[PDB]
Structures are given as C-alpha cells and as structure tokens.
Paper text:
The final step of exocytosis in yeast involves the assembly of two t-SNAREs, Sso1/2 and Sec9, with the v-SNARE, Snc1/2, on secretory vesicles. The exocytic vesicle-docking site in yeast is marked by the octameric exocyst complex, which belongs to the CATCHR family of multi-subunit tethering proteins. Our previous work showed that one of the exocyst components, Sec3, promotes SNARE assembly by interacting with the t-SNARE Sso2. Like syntaxin-1 and other related t-SNAREs, Sso2 consists of four helices, with the first three (Habc) forming an inhibitory domain and the last (H3) serving as the SNARE motif that interacts with the other two SNAREs during membrane fusion.
Recently, we crystallized another complex of the two proteins using a longer version of Sso2 (aa1–270), which contains all Sso2 sequence except for its C-terminal transmembrane part, together with a shorter Sec3 PH domain (aa75–260). Diffraction data to 2.19 Å resolution was collected at the ESRF synchrotron site and the crystal structure was determined by the molecular replacement method. The final model contains two copies of the Sso2/Sec3 complex per asymmetric unit, together with 418 ordered water molecules. One of the complexes contains residues 4–8, 33–149, and 197–226 of Sso2 and residues 76–250 of Sec3; the other contains residues 6–14, 33–148, and 196–226 of Sso2 and residues 76–250 of Sec3. Our crystal structure of this Sec3/Sso2 complex reveals a previously unknown binding site for Sec3 on Sso2 in addition to the one on its four-helix bundle as reported in our previous work. This extra binding site is located at the N-terminal end of Sso2 and consists of two highly conserved NPY (i.e. Asn-Pro-Tyr) motifs. The NPY motifs are connected to the highly conserved helical core of Sso2 via a non-conserved linker with variable lengths (roughly 15–40 residues), which is invisible in our crystal structure, suggesting that it is mobile within the crystal structure. In the two heterodimeric complexes present in the crystal structure, the two NPY motifs of the two Sso2 molecules bind individually to a similar conserved hydrophobic pocket on the two Sec3 molecules. Particularly, the tyrosine residues in both cases (i.e. Y7 and Y13) are docked into a conserved hydrophobic pocket on the concave surface on Sec3. Overall, the NPY motif adopts a T-shaped conformation, with its broad top part shaped by the asparagine (N) and the proline (P) residues, which is stabilized by a hydrogen bond between the carboxyl group of the asparagine and the amide proton of the proline.
Author numbering:
A (entry chain A): 76 to 250
B (entry chain B): 4 to 8, 33 to 149, 197 to 226
Write the structure that this text describes.
Amino acid sequence: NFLAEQYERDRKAIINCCFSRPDHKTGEPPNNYITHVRIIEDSKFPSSRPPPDSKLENKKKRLLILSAKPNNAKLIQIHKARENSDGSFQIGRTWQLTELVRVEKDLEISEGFILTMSKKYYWETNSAKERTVFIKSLITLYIQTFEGHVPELVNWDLSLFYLDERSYQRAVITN
Amino acid sequence: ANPYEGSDDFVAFMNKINSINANLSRYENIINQIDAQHKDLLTQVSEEQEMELRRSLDDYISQATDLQYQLKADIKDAQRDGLHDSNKQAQAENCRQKFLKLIQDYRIIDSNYKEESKEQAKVQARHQELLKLEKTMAELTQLFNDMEELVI
C-alpha cells in the first residue's frame, strides 16, 4: 500500500520537524498534528483551474497540514508547507479553520478542489482517492470543531460527510 | 490513524443487523422528538407547562445517551463478526454509516437550538441549560470519534 506507507513516512517527518518541539523563539508548545495531504500548486494559476497548456514548471509540490493549538482543541489551523531535501518541511502559510467558508469539488479535474478562506485557492491532490480522503477529514474536522456548522459545499456527495440535503441546509454557515 | 488503510451463521448475523436497524429507528425518533421539544420551548410557553417540557426533554436526552452506548457496542460487534466475510462487513458498515448520519443529525439539531436560544433571550437557570447542551455535544463528538476507530 504505497499511499498508506507514504502517509506513515510523511506524518512522522512532519511531526518531527514541525509538531513536536517547542517554538523556536517563543517556547510555546507545538501544535498537535491531525492530518495532511500532498497537493500540486500551479504558481501561475493558484486561484482557478489551470489550463492544460500550463507549463510543467508552474506545478509545485506542496503539503496541506491540519493541526490544533496545544491548549485548545477547538482552535484548528491549516498549514501549507514544502518539503526540504533532508526530509524536513518548511511551513509557508497558515490559515485559521474559521476562514474556511466554501469547499468545491472540480467536476472536470478528478484531483482538483477549491478552498475559499482568505481567498479562493485551487489545488490538486495526486489522486481522486486522496481528494476524497482529505476533504472528508477537513469537513469532518470543521463540523466537529464548530459544533454542527459546515462551510458551503459545492458538487460533493453529502453522505461523504454523514449529511443529507436538509441536515446540510440546517448546518451551512450561510444559514 | 492512517486514513489510507438462528442456527445458520448468516441468519444469526442478520439478527444482529435487524436488531441494530430497529434501535437506529428508535434513535432517529428520539432525536426527532428532541428537535420537536426544542421547537415547543422556542414558542412562548407558560411557566407551568415550561418545566414539564424541560423534564421530558431531559428524559429524551438520557434515552439518547443510553441508546448511543448500545448502538456503539452492537455495531462494533457486528463489525467484528464481519472481519472475515465480505457480505457481513458490508452489512455492519452500512449500519455504521446510518449511525454516524444520525449522530450528525443530533449534533446539528442541538446546534440550531443553542443559537436560537440566545437570539430569543437577549435567571441563572439558562446557564445550566447551556452547560447541559455543551455536555451532550462533547459526548456526540467523543461518540463520533469512537465510531471512526477501527475494530480489530
């Protein structure tokens, strides 16, 4: 199982670099790692579906990482990171989970999805399964974190998140 | 946590599934009645009838907690019996998904009632109600996680 073993190696490296030691300059406890996924980011088209003619040099390998504040399981953060040659990771951006307002499945690209937080971000997983697995983790985390609320969901099977039509209408943040 | 991985035997197993499906129906009705009593409280009810409505709500909440405990045990047991049979595992997992959706139904129903209580209010007994609601939602979250744990 390549995807399972890659997950085990990635998770151990992520926790080791970035979610186990006290803060470098502040001494705060580290965040608690929750999950992650590998993503492809197009540097020229980061907020929309990239065209097929997009140069291959535009494609960047990044990771999305979810974590919780050390003294508040209700404060979730999303981190984007890149992988260093030694096996460690460098976080380049952090969002608070309260920024997630819209999550859309790309109907045309089987690995594509769009998160609306600070703005719209287009990303691709490496496989359709990895999109299903990560978005499930993300929406499940949100519904649990914000006690019965859910961002706007576009083109998803609601049953993936244990919702149906009218449970989604009661829970969606747009009210 | 790696997300990337009755004498006849089948008649006996399906007796478990039939029993689970009956309690899932009981669970769904109890949640349905909890939602209804929330809507009753959200109408302006005389102080006498209001407390009879609160004790009935308390009774239904306790029934749900005990049904949840029984549904967890019975579903995880059906998952064990299916650890070596494709048909049994499909049956048990189907029951697990039904359970999780109802737990999600309950969690959303309590969330709507929590937010609608404040937007209708603005004594200290209202604070004890919020602590009871937060207790239940912590349990539903804890129960949600127990049901996602693998059975081995």
